[PDB]
Amino acid sequence: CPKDATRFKHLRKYTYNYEAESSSGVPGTADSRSATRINCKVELEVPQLCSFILKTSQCTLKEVYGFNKALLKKTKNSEEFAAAMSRYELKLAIPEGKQVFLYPEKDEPTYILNIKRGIISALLVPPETEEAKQVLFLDTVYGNCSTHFTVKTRKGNVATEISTERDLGQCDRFKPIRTGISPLAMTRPLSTLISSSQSCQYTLDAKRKHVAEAICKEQHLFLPFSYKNKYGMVAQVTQTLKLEDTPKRFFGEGTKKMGLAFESTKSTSPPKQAEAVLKTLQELKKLTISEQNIQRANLFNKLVTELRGLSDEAVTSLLPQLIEVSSPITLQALVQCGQPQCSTHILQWLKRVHANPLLIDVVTYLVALIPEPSAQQLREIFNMARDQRSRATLYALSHAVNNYHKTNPTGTQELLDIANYLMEQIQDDCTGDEDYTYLILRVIGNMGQTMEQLTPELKSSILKCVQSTKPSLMIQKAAIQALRKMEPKDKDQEVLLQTFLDDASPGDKRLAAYLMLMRSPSQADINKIVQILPWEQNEQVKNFVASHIANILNSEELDIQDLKKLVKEALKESQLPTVMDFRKFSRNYQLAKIEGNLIFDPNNYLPKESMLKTTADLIEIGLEGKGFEPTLEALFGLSVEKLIKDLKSKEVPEARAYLRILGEELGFASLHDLQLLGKLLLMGARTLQGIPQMIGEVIRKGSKNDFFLHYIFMENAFELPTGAGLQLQISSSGVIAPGAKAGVKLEVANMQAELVAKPSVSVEFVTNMGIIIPDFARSGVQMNTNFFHESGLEAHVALKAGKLKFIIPSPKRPVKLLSGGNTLHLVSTTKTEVIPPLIENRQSWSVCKQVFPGLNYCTSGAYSNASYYPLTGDTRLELELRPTGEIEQYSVSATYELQDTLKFVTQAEGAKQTEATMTFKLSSEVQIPDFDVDL
Numbered sequence: 002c003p004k005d006a007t008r009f010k011h012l013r014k015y016t017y018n019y020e021a022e023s024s025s026g027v028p029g030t031a032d033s034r035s036a037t038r039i040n041c042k043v044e045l046e047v048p049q050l051c052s053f054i055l056k057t058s059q060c061t062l063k064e065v066y067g068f069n070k071a072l073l074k075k076t077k078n079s080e081e082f083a084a085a086m087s088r089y090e091l092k093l094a095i096p097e098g099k100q101v102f103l104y105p106e107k108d109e110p111t112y113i114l115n116i117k118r119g120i121i122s123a124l125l126v127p128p129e130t131e132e133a134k135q136v137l138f139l140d141t142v143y144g145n146c147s148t149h150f151t152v153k154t155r156k157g158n159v160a161t162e163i164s165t166e167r168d169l170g171q172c173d174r175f176k177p178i179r180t181g182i183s184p185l186a187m188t189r190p191l192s193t194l195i196s197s198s199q200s201c202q203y204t205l206d207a208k209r210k211h212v213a214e215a216i217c218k219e220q221h222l223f224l225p226f227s228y229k230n231k232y233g234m235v236a237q238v239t240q241t242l243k244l245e246d247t248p249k250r251f252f253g254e255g256t257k258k259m260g261l262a263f264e265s266t267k268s269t270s271p272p273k274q275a276e277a278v279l280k281t282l283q284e285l286k287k288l289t290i291s292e293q294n295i296q297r298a299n300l301f302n303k304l305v306t307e308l309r310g311l312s313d314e315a316v317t318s319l320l321p322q323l324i325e326v327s328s329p330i331t332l333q334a335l336v337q338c339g340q341p342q343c344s345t346h347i348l349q350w351l352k353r354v355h356a357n358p359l360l361i362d363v364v365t366y367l368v369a370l371i372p373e374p375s376a377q378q379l380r381e382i383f384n385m386a387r388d389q390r391s392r393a394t395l396y397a398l399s400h401a402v403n404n405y406h407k408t409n410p411t412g413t414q415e416l417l418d419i420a421n422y423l424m425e426q427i428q429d430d431c432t433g434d435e436d437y438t439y440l441i442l443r444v445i446g447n448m449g450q451t452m453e454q455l456t457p458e459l460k461s462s463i464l465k466c467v468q469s470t471k472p473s474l475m476i477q478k479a480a481i482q483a484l485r486k487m488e489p490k491d492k493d494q495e496v497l498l499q500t501f502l503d504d505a506s507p508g509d510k511r512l513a514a515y516l517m518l519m520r521s522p523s524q525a526d527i528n529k530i531v532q533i534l535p536w537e538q539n540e541q542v543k544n545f546v547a548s549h550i551a552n553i554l555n556s557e558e559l560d561i562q563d564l565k566k567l568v569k570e571a572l573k574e575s576q577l578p579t580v581m582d583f584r585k586f587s588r589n590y591q592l593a594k595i596e597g598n599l600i601f602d603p604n605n606y607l608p609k610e611s612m613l614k615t616t617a618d619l620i621e622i623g624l625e626g627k628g629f630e631p632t633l634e635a636l637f638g639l640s641v642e643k644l645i646k647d648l649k650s651k652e653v654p655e656a657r658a659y660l661r662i663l664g665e666e667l668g669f670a671s672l673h674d675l676q677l678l679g680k681l682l683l684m685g686a687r688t689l690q691g692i693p694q695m696i697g698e699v700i701r702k703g704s705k706n707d708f709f710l711h712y713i714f715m716e717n718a719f720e721l722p723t724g725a726g727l728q729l730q731i732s733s734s735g736v737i738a739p740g741a742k743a744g745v746k747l748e749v750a751n752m753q754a755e756l757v758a759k760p761s762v763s764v765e766f767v768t769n770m771g772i773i774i775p776d777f778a779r780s781g782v783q784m785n786t787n788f789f790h791e792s793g794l795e796a797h798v799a800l801k802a803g804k805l806k807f808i809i810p811s812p813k814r815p816v817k818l819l820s821g822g823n824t825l826h827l828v829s830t831t832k833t834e835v836i837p838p839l840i841e842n843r844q845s846w847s848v849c850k851q852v853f854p855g856l857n858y859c860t861s862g863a864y865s866n867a868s869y870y871p872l873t874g875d876t877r878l879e880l881e882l883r884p885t886g887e888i889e890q891y892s893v894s895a896t897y898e899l900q901d902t903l904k905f906v907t908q909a910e911g912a913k914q915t916e917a918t919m920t921f922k923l924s925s926e927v928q929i930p931d932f933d934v935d936l
């Protein structure tokens with residue numbers, strides 16, 4: 002801490018008045034600007050030298066809504082904003098004069114923090130020097146930059162008046178930021194084509210060398226097409242401090258030694274500022290009837306803006322409200338959003354509309370394998386899996402939790418929620434749904450290692466499943482390999498051994514327990530097993546264990562060499578007995594340890610269990626089967642006549658194979674799964690038979706759908722140094738939006754028909770710097786130039802009272818042909834409103850021509866001829882066809898009036914009425930009103 006680093010005296014508080022105005026727009030062309038006024042009363046407490054405390058009160062924000070005179074009022078966000086302002090005090094350290102440190106409140110919101118940082122950034126003032134003009138590297142809210150120590154005027158010894166420049170394009174913290182761009186998406190070139198600087202002045206006092214009053218202003222101009230770097234899309238932000246009083250030890254130390262460097266905060270608006278998002282969808286409802294699809298691309302841009310500023314909680318809460326107005330537009334908006342929450346949304350909608358839940362589970366299973374998990378998506382996939390519990394859902398969740406743990410080893414509460422949900426699923430000892438219990442065991446046998454640090458009950462519950470034989474034998478076994486990927490604890494190993502020595506235990510169960518234990522072998526257990534085996538009765542498990550002993554003793558791997566030596570030392574008293582025929586005896590073929598396990602009931606010889614390993618735990622192949630020995634004995638144990646009748650009498654075949662790769666159980670298939678597949682094919686056949694029924698809905702007609710497809714081809718949005726503290730983001734979006742409004746409504750029996758689907762294309766170059774205060778206010782003006790073309794025709798053919806009138810409806814809305822030229826819009830936090838176009842020098846040219854009787858092919862435009870175009874001002878270029886009113890529309894009418902006066906009239910109804918009429922008897926009339934050849 003230098004002797005005279007600061008120009009302030011401790012034990013002398015400072016009552017200052019902070020102000021700021023974030024004006025934005027195009028100078029010269031007009032004067033109406035998008036500005037967000039803000040002011041507050043700042044209490045600077047001074048515990049000691051180079052130690053400060055910040056308090057603030059009466060932080061009132063004012064919003065521009067009119068001119069005569071910048072009309073200002075109080076926002077609905079202002080009160081809670083000031084509440085956050087006065088919620089906490091701040092601590093400031095500036096040791097050594099250069100090093101500056103922030104001590105914030107731990108719970109103080111980060112945007113509030115950087116707001117305060119921006120406020121205090123201008124508060125720094127560098128001590129005087131002999132040179133009136135100087136340039137020094139000084140830190141700001143965005144790190145060290147080149148300040149300009151320029152004495153406005155000096156009293157020789159002192160200079161109360163002073164000025165400083167900081168060209169913001171030369172700041173250390175000038176780095177841009179990542180943004181929630183469209184997934185189908187240039188930073189430094191954008192920095193080049195923009196301006197960023199501050200230039201301002203300050204007033205000290207001669208009496209006490211304290212800043213009397215300071216004022217700062219900045220410039221942020223879209224350089225291309227700008228006029229002498231002084232006109233065009235510019236953002237000028239103010240920051241003014243006004244002293245009011247300097248009233249009258251301990252300094253509050255903060256644990257977080259935060260730096261004055263700006264912290265990136267995602268631009269956002271609260272539900273109060275995000276209420277109109279539903280109206281943001283209602284707007285494209287208007288083109289349902291208004292059909293003026295020129296602004297549809299701009300509407301989609303508004304959608305992009307609101308979703309970027311949206312909150313996950315709100316959107317998740319009101320997704321059905323989003324989707325109700327029209328599903329596919331909402332879906333494509335979510336796709337193009339580029340925001341993580343969108344990923345969660347659609348499937349939540351999907352199950353909400355029963356849109357083939359089978360493929361819903363399929364796609365969720367597909368997406369759960371991503372290596373970039375999110376907690377909210379984990380919660381919702383857990384919820385949906387609990388909902389339907391299909392194989393795909395459970396496998397998806399099983400892989401997703403492992404992926405999340407691998408990516409994020411840090412534990413979270415949702416993992417505990419999943420764990421207790423699972424232990425509820427198994428209840429006490431896995432007495433629930435047999436196949437569901439099997440599937441959830443297959444699940445847990447993958448991430449129980451991840452959850453090992455979470456709940457010790459994991460083992461305690463599942464051993465209850467292991468010990469209790471109330472569940473069926475298959476689930477009984479599955480309880481063991483639920484622990485297969487689990488590290489056996491001492492209690493686990495003891496329970497395993499106690500269940501293991503049971504002779505009434507099935508041979509496969511005992512062997513599986515043996516394998517699970519020998520995962521972590523114990524010398525005493527091996528000794529007792531070796532001493533028991535000579536009197537062992539189950540021959541096939543004896544062959545299996547002898548094979549396993551041979552595998553370990555002959556394991557050439559040095560990793561198993563020590564274990565082989567230990568087993569040889571144990572078996573020195575007596576070696577293992579003879580090995581049986583591996584062709585027809587249960588034996589472990591632990592062949593890089595590839596293990597073959599063909600185990601059967603000692604009564605029979607067909608291996609009920611066929612396990613194959615591969616090795617990390619590369620691949621695991623298993624299969625448990627039963628009910629096939631009677632099938633074999635059907636002929637093995639003239640015949641065909643009795644066999645055909647005996648087919649149904651055979652015991653029900655029962656098989657279930659499974660595959661687990663990299664620990665995670667990939668999936669299993671059983672004969673029950675096979676008949677499930679048969680039922681699924683039956684459902685598919687029903688769906689295929691449903692199309693004859695669907696043709697009724699097809700012919701029901703009476704519909705109109707605005708198939709408009711949006712896209713963003715350029716997405717380069719970021720954040721750059723904001724002098725106003727409130728973030729200066731940068732939005733750049735080129736948006737295309739073609740599409741047609743197609744719908745069916747007719748009546749064949751009534752002889753009714755019409756034409757639909759006029760297609761059109763729109764373009765939006767939404768580009769500026771976003772002067773937006775996250776959750777508080779938004780200001781600025783993006784470039785608004787639209788390249789729109791209109792095409793397609795609509796007709797209407799009907800028949801009534803025998804009059805076959807074939808109407809050619811000229812639309813009430815004149816049909817456009819091409820649109821071009823800029824039409825800008827002052828964008829406010831509440832609602833953007835059209836920027837008024839220029840008047841002088843805007844040649845209001847309008848070339849029209851009644852090319853066809855009743856219709857006018859016309860075009861018009863205006864632009865002033867001093868920024869380069871289109872920054873010069875509003876530009877118009879519109880070519881279209883408009884009804885002249887003399888003909889409201891055309892219609893070809895015909896009625897078989899027997900006399901027969903079968904009229905054939907091409908009436909062009911309207912103020913004028915031209916028609917070719919044909920009535921034949923033979924009355925050969927040929928009427929042409931235009932040339933008036935009315936034969």
Ligand SMILES: *[C@@H]1O[C@H](CO)[C@@H](O)[C@H](O)[C@H]1NC(C)=O
Pocket residue numbers: 099100138139140144145146173
């Ligand atoms: C000032 O800029 C210099 C350039 O040498 C740099 O070393 C220093 O860290 C900067 N100071 C701050 C406070 O950013």
